[PDB]
Design a protein around this ligand. Structure first.
Ligand SMILES: [Ca+2]
Ligand SMILES: [Ca+2]
Lengths: 89, 89, 87, 88
């Protein structure tokens, strides 16, 4: 499974995707480093999450990203169109 | 499934347990009334949630309480000891 | 978001797709009618799930499909290439 | 966070607890040893799960418990009264 955040940036810069993930991490009170397998493709930022002490899942992080999307946006200078969890087995 | 919060109160008051849910409501962007089947028994608050637009689960609200635990404790005069989501089977 | 099962049938029949869903429903102890917005396109079955009592998310049900891959394949008569949730 | 199963046994035996986990592991196709931080306290089994080759969460495994409640009860000779996922 993976988490995703679709932006209004076509395409999305790595700097901006990573900046989003760091602001997001601090908002969920975890290490930035707990976000792994990070990519930006098209307007989309993807990632997975490491086994963390706080115990947040991808469901947890993507949910919170939608809840504070207004502060995430204004911090990063981009718009968040949608968030959620993808899966491929 | 039901959600719970175990406090250090003996017993937890109805006003306090309810306040906890109201604070959670505002953070997860929902009407307090989306919380149903509400009880305070001993030190514990129990509750269910009505189904919603956001795919917000009882899991999302307990995870929310962990992030805002200081703010919940500050507003209701108690310590939060435990949090969770259980299914009577 | 949609759940999908990708098969080795090019294209996949609606009948075969719906059969998969009926076996998946059986094994997650939900009504077949809980799978909504069903389509077969190319080799893929796509679907979503109704908010249900058992509290199974779309990703959770597709994880379960992954766990019963062998049984779905056996009861339907096709190979499953991939299972998951897309955007 | 820990997953938990509350039984009718007071107290729950360590044997019976680890047997519930071994039945569940079989259903989620992982080794029983994938379940870690295992305890039995009074009637309740608690546990966690190694980040896994298959993706499953504590929520996922307790949902699996519900699907196989009768099998679990049939093999362990106890009743399951609650499942869930908690946090100290
Ligand atoms: Ca209200
Ligand atoms: Ca899951």
């Amino acid at each position: 499974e993976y988490g995703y955040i679709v932006t209004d940036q076509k395409p999305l810069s790595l700097a901006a995707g990573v900046k989003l993930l760091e602001i997001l991490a601090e908002h969920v009170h975890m290490s930035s480093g707990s976000f792994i397998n990070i990519s930006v493709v098209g307007p989309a930022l993807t990632f997975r999450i490491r086994h963390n002490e706080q115990n947040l899942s991808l469901a947890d992080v993507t949910q919170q990203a939608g809840l504070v999307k207004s502060e995430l946006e204004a911090q990063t200078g981009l718009q968040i169109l949608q968030t959620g969890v993808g899966q491929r087995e």
